[PDB]
Design an enzyme around this catalytic site. Structure first.
Site, PDB file in Angstrom:
ATOM      1  CG  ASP A 187      65.919 -17.362  68.700  1.00  0.00           C
ATOM      2  OD1 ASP A 187      67.089 -17.274  69.096  1.00  0.00           O
ATOM      3  OD2 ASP A 187      65.118 -18.195  69.159  1.00  0.00           O
ATOM      4  CB  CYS A 221      61.763 -10.791  63.969  1.00  0.00           C
ATOM      5  SG  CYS A 221      63.029 -10.095  62.906  1.00  0.00           S
ATOM      6  NE  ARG A 227      62.924 -14.288  64.464  1.00  0.00           N
ATOM      7  CZ  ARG A 227      62.738 -14.280  65.781  1.00  0.00           C
ATOM      8  NH1 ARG A 227      61.807 -15.073  66.322  1.00  0.00           N
ATOM      9  NH2 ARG A 227      63.484 -13.496  66.560  1.00  0.00           N
ATOM     10  CB  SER A 228      61.966  -8.641  59.624  1.00  0.00           C
ATOM     11  OG  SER A 228      61.285  -8.594  60.857  1.00  0.00           O
ATOM     12  CD  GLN A 268      71.514 -12.350  60.975  1.00  0.00           C
ATOM     13  OE1 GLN A 268      72.239 -12.894  61.791  1.00  0.00           O
ATOM     14  NE2 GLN A 268      71.943 -11.398  60.152  1.00  0.00           N
TER      15      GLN A 268
END
Ligand SMILES: NC(=O)[C@H](Cc1ccc(C(F)(F)P(=O)(O)O)cc1)NC(=O)[C@H](Cc1ccccc1)NC(=O)Cc1ccc(C(F)(F)P(=O)(O)O)cc1
Ligand SMILES: CCCCCCCCO[C@@H]1O[C@H](CO)[C@@H](O)[C@H](O)[C@H]1O
Length: 286
Positions: A187, A221, A227-228, A268
């Site tokens: 993450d 995710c 991540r997506s 992110q």
């Protein structure tokens, strides 16, 4: 795509990288990202359907379940016109939304599901195990009338691939769902390497799960944005490179800002933005 295109892309990456400019670029994206209402996501009755109160789908692009009771699911349709590809980005399913998740998969006629997180991250449940195991290869969903069976499972170093069979109990229609789980993407982190990420992406692609002949691939995710977002930005930029007369004209920031009109917070960290770029120029080679 000739060698000069490659040369310019690689040189550009090198200039940004050696000068450590990803932070400024990422800041401009965050500062310029659009904002839209998320009224449905914020209704009290939908509180238990959201994993995070700060991650919600915009009303204009949220996926609606075809059921009448409550059609809400924290999932967004990302439609990239030029690239000619649609993706559904969603949060990792909660124990009470696994049925909704598969209901959505069924209704949107998806062929593949791409999972980029792990069930437990930092000590807590970030995604319910919405798929079966070897000991109990069959799951039946509460109030959604679907049955899911694990047909095969191939565990590799960086990801796992499963063939699942999804059945509508009412009609007895069965469909094959391919599950692509990248298992080593922390993450707020990056994949193991551009190569393993690309091998993964190409496996998804080669399966046909991203083709217009099937409904949108479902990508998720934990929150369904970092991540997506990185995964989708790379796939879209490679698609644009293969379609445009001048592949070096792809504007990564503009594409990500366009994607962000459909779901908040895609990508992110500045390092994820950097990785996407790297994945694209390395993937352009193939
Ligand atoms: N920001 C984050 O890291 C994540 C979302 C995220 C998680 C993972 C990822 C990701 F990038 F890893 P991925 O790749 O999975 O998208 C992106 C975003 N959000 C959070 O951690 C937030 C608190 C918070 C809010 C704002 C800022 C900081 C912390 N926690 C929650 O929202 C959970 C939550 C806590 C408490 C309540 C409540 F008080 F209202 P209630 O009265 O119902 O008990 C509702 C929801
Ligand atoms: C996500 C993939 C993005 C690829 C963007 C490639 C942009 C190429 O852009 C070119 O890069 C050269 C090298 O620095 C510069 O000298 C040129 O002026 C610039 O137009």
């Amino acid at each position: 795509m000739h060698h000069h295109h490659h040369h310019e892309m690689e040189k550009e990456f090198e200039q940004i990288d050696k000068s450590g400019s990803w932070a400024a670029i990422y800041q401009d994206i965050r500062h310029e990202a659009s904002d839209f209402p998320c009224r449905v996501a914020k209704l009290p009755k939908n509180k238990n359907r959201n994993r995070y109160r700060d991650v919600s789908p915009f009303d204009h692009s949220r996926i609606k379940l075809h059921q009448e009771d409550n059609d809400y699911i924290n999932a967004s349709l990302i439609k990239m016109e030029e690239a000619q590809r649609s993706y559904i980005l969603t949060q990792g399913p909660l124990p009470n939304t696994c049925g909704h998740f598969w209901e959505m998969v069924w209704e949107q006629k998806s062929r593949g599901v791409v999972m980029l997180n792990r069930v437990m991250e930092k000590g807590s449940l970030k995604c319910a195990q919405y798929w079966p195991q070897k000991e109990e290869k069959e799951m039946i969903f509460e109030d959604t009338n679907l049955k899911l069976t694990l047909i095969s499972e191939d565990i590799k170093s960086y990801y796992t691939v499963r063939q699942l069979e999804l059945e509508n109990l009412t009609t007895q229609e069965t469909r094959e769902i391919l599950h692509f789980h990248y298992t080593t993407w922390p993450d707020f982190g990056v994949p193991e390497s551009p190569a393993s990420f690309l091998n993964f992406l190409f496996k998804v692609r080669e399966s046909g799960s991203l083709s217009p002949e099937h409904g949108p691939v479902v990508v998720h995710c934990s929150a369904g944005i970092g991540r997506s977002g990185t995964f989708c930005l790379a796939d879209t930029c490679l698609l644009l490179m293969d379609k445009r007369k001048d592949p070096s004209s792809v504007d990564i920031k503009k594409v990500l800002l366009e994607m962000r009109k459909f779901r908040m917070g895609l990508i992110q960290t500045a390092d994820q933005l950097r990785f996407s770029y790297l994945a694209v120029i390395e993937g352009a080679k193939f």
